[PDB]
Design a protein around this nucleic acid. Sequence first.
DNA 1: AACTACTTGAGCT
RNA 2: AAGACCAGGC
DNA 3: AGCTCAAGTAGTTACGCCGGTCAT
Lengths: 134, 1417, 49, 8, 107, 277
Amino acid sequence: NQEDSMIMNQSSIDRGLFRSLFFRSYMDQEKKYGMSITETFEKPQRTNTLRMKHGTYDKLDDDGLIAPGVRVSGEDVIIGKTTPISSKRDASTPLRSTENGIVDQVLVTTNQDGLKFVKVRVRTTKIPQIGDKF
Amino acid sequence: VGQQYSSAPLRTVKEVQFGLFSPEEVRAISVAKIRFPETMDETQTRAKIGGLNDPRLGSIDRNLKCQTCQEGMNECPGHFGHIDLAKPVFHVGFIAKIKKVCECVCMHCGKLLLDEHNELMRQALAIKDSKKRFAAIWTLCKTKMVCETDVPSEDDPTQLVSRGGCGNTQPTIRKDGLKLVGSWKDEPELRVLSTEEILNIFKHISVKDFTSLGFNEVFSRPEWMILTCLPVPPPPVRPSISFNESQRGEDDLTFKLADILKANISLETLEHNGAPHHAIEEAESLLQFHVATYMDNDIAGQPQALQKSGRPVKSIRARLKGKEGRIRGNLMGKRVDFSARTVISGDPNLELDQVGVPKSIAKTLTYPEVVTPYNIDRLTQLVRNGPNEHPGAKYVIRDSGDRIDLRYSKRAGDIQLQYGWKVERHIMDNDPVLFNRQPSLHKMSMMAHRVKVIPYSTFRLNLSVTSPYNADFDGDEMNLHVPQSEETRAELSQLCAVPLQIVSPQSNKPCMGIVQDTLCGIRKLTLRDTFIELDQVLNMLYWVPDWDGVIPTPAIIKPKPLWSGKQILSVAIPNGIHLQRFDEGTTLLSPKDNGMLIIDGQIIFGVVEKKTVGSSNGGLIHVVTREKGPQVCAKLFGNIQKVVNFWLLHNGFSTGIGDTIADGPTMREITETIAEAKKKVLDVTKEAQANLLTAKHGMTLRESFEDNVVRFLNEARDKAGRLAEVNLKDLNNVKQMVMAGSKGSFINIAQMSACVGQQSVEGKRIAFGFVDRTLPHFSKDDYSPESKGFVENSYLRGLTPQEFFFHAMGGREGLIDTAVKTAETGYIQRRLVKALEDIMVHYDNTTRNSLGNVIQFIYGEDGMDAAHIEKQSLDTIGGSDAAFEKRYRVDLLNTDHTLDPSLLESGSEILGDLKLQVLLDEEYKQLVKDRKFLREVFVDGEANWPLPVNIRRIIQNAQQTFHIDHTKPSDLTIKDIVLGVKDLQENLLVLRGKNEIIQNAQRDAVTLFCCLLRSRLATRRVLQEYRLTKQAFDWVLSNIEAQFLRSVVHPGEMVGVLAAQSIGEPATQMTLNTFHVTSGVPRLKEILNVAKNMKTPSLTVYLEPGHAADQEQAKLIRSAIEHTTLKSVTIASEIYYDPDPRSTVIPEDEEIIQLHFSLQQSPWLLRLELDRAAMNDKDLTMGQVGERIKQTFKNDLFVIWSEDNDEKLIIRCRVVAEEDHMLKKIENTMLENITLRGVENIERVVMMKYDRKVPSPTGEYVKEPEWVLETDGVNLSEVMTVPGIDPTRIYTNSFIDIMEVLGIEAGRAALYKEVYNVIASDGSYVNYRHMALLVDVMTTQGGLTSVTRHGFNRSNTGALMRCSFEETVEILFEAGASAELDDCRGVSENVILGQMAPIGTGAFDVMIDEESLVKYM
Amino acid sequence: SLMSCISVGTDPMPIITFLSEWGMEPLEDYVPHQSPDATRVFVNGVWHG
Amino acid sequence: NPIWGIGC
Amino acid sequence: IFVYQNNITPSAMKLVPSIPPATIETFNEAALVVNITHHELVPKHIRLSSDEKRELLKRYRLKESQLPRIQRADPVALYLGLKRGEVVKIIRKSETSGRYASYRICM
Amino acid sequence: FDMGGYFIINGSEKVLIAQERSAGNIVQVFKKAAPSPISHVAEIRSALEKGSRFISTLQVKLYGREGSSARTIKATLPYIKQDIPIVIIFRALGIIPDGEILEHICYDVNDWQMLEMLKPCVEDGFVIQDRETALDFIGKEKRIQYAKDILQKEFLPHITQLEGFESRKAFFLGYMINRLLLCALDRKDQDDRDHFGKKRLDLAGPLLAQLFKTLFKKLTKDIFRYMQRTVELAINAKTITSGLKYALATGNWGEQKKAMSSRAGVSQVLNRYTYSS
DNA sequence: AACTACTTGAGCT
RNA sequence: AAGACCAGGC
DNA sequence: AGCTCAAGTAGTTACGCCGGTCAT
Ligand SMILES: [Mg+2]
Ligand SMILES: [Zn+2]
Ligand SMILES: [Zn+2]
């Protein structure tokens, strides 16, 4: 407990003392052009381009989204988007490398420009640890 | 590095040559004709038009293509192209010189404007300095504007001789935007000098003339300062950033190249078609601009030149500007691989030098260990283990420069290594690594630690290694770096290991002690009252790892067998550790248990705390390091720790409000010490609101009021606390935590249990922000303390709104500078660094730089490494002549003054020997030479100084190594002793040279030591004081010698950076405030700038030899110096109309006329009414006053005056076409250009009684205070030759002056003294050598070269070097301009190059001796 | 602070008027000596008599 | 210092 | 060695370097009232034969320029009447060794 | 529990941050360092509380340091190259005789000190004896006319820029030249630069103001172009919508364009770590 | 924000 | 992907 | 026409290490 570092009673840390939920919301859109060329929200693979990520896309239902139950981690693709140009370059979103948790709420929506708006929220319970500040 | 072997020989840059591109060369080099301004699109088709970027230059898209010189992107440095400009342009940054050149050369012809013929020119022409030549030259030729064809030869100005011709008048040129124009001359004739015109003239300029000006015919000819063909830089320079594929993305420069390109095209297409000759120039100025832009886009003639959007457009030179910009941003410091950083929290179970690393991290950072038949077995295991098991690895690299990824490769667990392959393994326990915490202002802000992989996400460092980095655990983070070569590691462990760092060279004392818990508790455990029983005395011995496995005999056996901390704590102290102390009432049976005495490595007596185990001088640590070594001492921490921390774990310790409450009656006794103190204020306020007090000379009646109120409340507050201090028993926890020395002090207790104190800003108690009041809750003009900010309450009690507020306003000031001095201090630091970098001891013992220029002939004036030095006391110097003799005097020809034969073994057979009494004279006669020589170096008498080889201890070691009795006699010939100490002096070699000048330096830079040496090795002491046997002596001697030789500085020692920091560090720890003469932070600043007008100039002058404590003699000089003007004694002046020069229209004047006609003029009068009280202060006389006046004007102004007796002092006068105008101009000339007494610039002059130690006739030094006059302004040359002063001691803090009057030397002396007094005015201690080195560097080049862009960064140092601080780019420009050559001898150069710099470790070569590589087998 | 608030912006005239009709002899016609210790009045930084 | 005295 | 009381004329002194080999110096009166060398801070200097000099250089391996300098118009430099090219050994007290030996060439 | 008070641009909650500043339309007197041809000076920053809002200040200097014989008083006017000696500023105003000028400055014939000070000044202007020349020396017929202008629309423009009030401004310039001396004679201290009462806080509401104008005014002269082409609808109500958004979104008040010469900070991203946050 | 460098301006023979 | 701005950490 | 002396005006460079939001 020397030099401004304090000792915290594990036992009560377990009984839930100072535990806290942590939320996050990665969000994306489906860009277009006055020149009818739109993007996509799917579960892309192969298909002439390669432009893809390292992680997994399997926790992606066919709507290009995860379900709120899914336990995502490492880098697991949270969203699936594509760009047809001249035939599939990826624009899918990956859970930040340091993070992980569980999906907590997905939602689809319109944009003023009638585009597909989708935000995703992930939850995590954060436990006090031998280093956290108080 | 690079990838793919290159047959071409490998070399390192040993020299850099600067110059300017000759158009013909750029053409030569170019691989692209570059005509088109677009990028590629073969009409939308992606490729790269043969027009811009890659019309053969480098390339994009991962395509080997690049003129078949393949290599694809990585391996292919860029490839330059060019572009033929339509018309000559000015190189944006040279436009200055291009102009100063013309100012020096004639047009229509093109030759110099001053030949050897002109004398002042010869001189300039001989100035050897490519820069100061072209400097002095222009200072001449910028005047003459007649290309003279004939001038008088070196004979008679009668005849004239001819040289070059065509005297066409040369125009006066001026700068207007990007064009040079001038006038030729009634009334001028203006024309705009074209570029084409200028260039032509330059081309013609003669070759020996290029050279006359700052040029070089080979590398940079004056003309090339104008560009013809523009060098176009390639892709890696201005990369493109595409947004996937079907989207643009082009760099900034890849535009102003095209903007230029386009401004070129149109130009030409106007010069080959209907060219409206005066509408082209309107289009030429554009190209001149875009090319100014491209390179520089931050100029005078505003026109920022923004890119479509407002974006400024980074000019090439913008990419370089120091900090962030290439030089200071990418070269002097870059982000590196193999590094990590997280949150620190100390761990009390980690050897001093360890550093717990989170498994996670170790599993991330690797280390390339080549396969070798010693570690193959272990490596093949670590490899199988994979990158996910901790003691594992993550990459294997075969000879075939290719890498296997241990986490994918289908042959992951397969792989059987091959000697010679390298494997990247996870960092493991005991891997040396660089741990640091920035701000990094110490040699110790970075130290190598033993790695200890541990769980949990945090770097776990030892407590005692806390203060070096200066960290705490409130969230602080730490950076870690991982060595990579086998030597890199070694270099990290042999010089940066934490143990080596324990003794800090900046303050020749350790720099890591025992903090908090361990300290606090070690104190308790020591008290006589602290006892421990077997059960625990055992679990305590167990925790000491080195424990011999032997329980020491109980300090008590009688009823219960107990032990005392002092005992067990001692089991941690190694054998041979001898420590002696003595505090206040301390004597070999310390009553209050003070002092400290440890013999044989066992605590004998005294309590242990900050003083005995802190980062202090006598420090048991400081001693264990010196006596046992880095290692032994480094372990010592952990032990003293482990025992104590454990003990405390069980004895417990705390603090609570209860520790801050004062006795029932004491809290009262104080209250009324504030009440009474309140009235001693109300009292002097009454006595002020009555004018019943006199003005203490030099202070305002008001100021003097404060000066007391302040000194009243302060003394009140001072005891207010002191009542409680002694009111807190030896059980008060807070007290305990203060004695241990582990936290807080008196002040603290005070503000918490007694009185908080007086609040303040800008030095004065809470102002009157509200007209005449503190808060609106106050009555106007309330000068009391309850209004001006005096918090009478204690924290335990609680502030009242008012008190609470003021308090805030007070703290607010505090927080301010802790948030200002924070980075300005860092600048001042940075400067010192970039100012001594290249200073390092050399193999001959010279302290020089990247020029060999000798800054110091023997580092520190002795060639000693501060680490090996301690505060010794030169005996000889102090004490009475009487007591001196009775100590070192030996007289074999005397019954009473001879060595009793109970000391020596030949005491009786020696008594009377004439031949011996002579060697005994040589000796005693010596010691006296010393005594008088030391009072010649240290006129203070202070006999304590830092000196290598601690002789006091070295002898104490003999003391018990041979066990000597204070009874039975020694066995040394008198020759044994005396002769033996002479033979020693002979081997204490610092410099080694064969010749004399060197051999002299030897004796020189040694002396001081030798005296200390004699002082403790005089026959008398050596036998009567420390009965040394013959044996002992031969040992002490041999050791002094050995020790010394280790205490010498090592050639390599990067001395400059050291002293640089050593100085700036103890500055980051000061306040920007100059409160509580301009000193501290701002002062140092003031100095390093070599300021021409310091805030406080002031100057101290001492009386003359005799008259010392002559009170009235003081005044008698004051008023002969302190500048007094008529203006300061005149209450009013009026100009009446009195036409009768024999009577007045004024009453109180009559007498004054008649009484002034016994033992022509103007009818206009001028009367002055001087002040009475003002004539007694600066002391003056009507006789004098007027006398002066009269002789000021003289025969054209008759003046009169009354006599000192009257009740109204006056001075009438008249002159001798409008007089009311004249007699008014003479009104001023009287009040502001006329002095009475004093030397100008010298206002206020106070007197003071100072402490001056001095030689009593009877020998001993004693208190003899003497008056001294301090000024408030500065003139020397004059206030020096005044009768009554000692022009051998006078002193102004204005070093600038001192140097001008007493010779640079004396100047240096001041510069140092002033810097020293700035560090020392803060309690902090730094070792001479540091300040000196700085002082010396500023001084050596001849004068006072400031530590600023206008100083060191302006010498003959390398170009790349100075370029890495402040003027970054121009420094290069005027470097390629005059074609400078850089040694690459500067630390910087090499860092910038990526080569090992000549720094300690690299200040030499390592070669295999084939000869000896054969005899070994 | 908790209690602090900022002004917002009222109107001048309903007070300029309210004045030059309760003792405010307008600046326009002033005489420094007949009106010696005349307390001068300012409105939002203007001198209205 | 600031919050104790002038001199301090 | 002329000792001008208040000041010499600009027409005058412009005739000093007009009689070589011999050389001439000018010293103001009010500037010689107190011998400056006498000062506390002023350490002892000393000249050097073109022999004692051509020695220092060999003994330390110096290129002349690498040697600490001293100004021609330096108070002490004038006092001992130096010249551009002459060396000076300075010998002062030192709280570290007792006496240090520095050298300044006169530029 | 959300007390609100914030805007919601493109999603994120933006909070306009109060901008403190030195209030306007007030008299200040400052002493100017020993090294300066000026002794003391009094200033007054003026701007129409409602209508355009000019940012031009009045400088009533006081040359001649606390010694030299020439202690004159000159003042600076908007658009005038050099400075004018107060006397002329008065005659050019509508007061032509001496003592009628001292009438306005000093309010106590028995204060010789102050008056004395003025003396040397009177002498300065003794060369211009009427309203004709008065408005002249301010650089014929062409110049005289402009002289007027800078007095009815530039000179102490608050008070009013009407016409027949010359008198009023004169009493001010008098109250000013007074305030100057009131200090140069140690009777009133130099104005306290940080007396919070004399500083204003431009909250949210105000900000939109100075902002809107900048906008609506580009719409104003925009609607001027459609009307300047019809040799015989148009109002792009997007400059007031998109303009507003830009600012509030980033934190750069002043427009966009090649005008970064604005201030970033105004409008931020409302904290949501804790309620008290 | 403050200085210090560099060059320019106005007073003065 | 680079930059700018605000915020916050010792 | 020309020269010393003071002042003005120009211009430069400054600060250790370490998430959100916006837009070319
Ligand atoms: Mg901290
Ligand atoms: Zn290539
Ligand atoms: Zn010519």
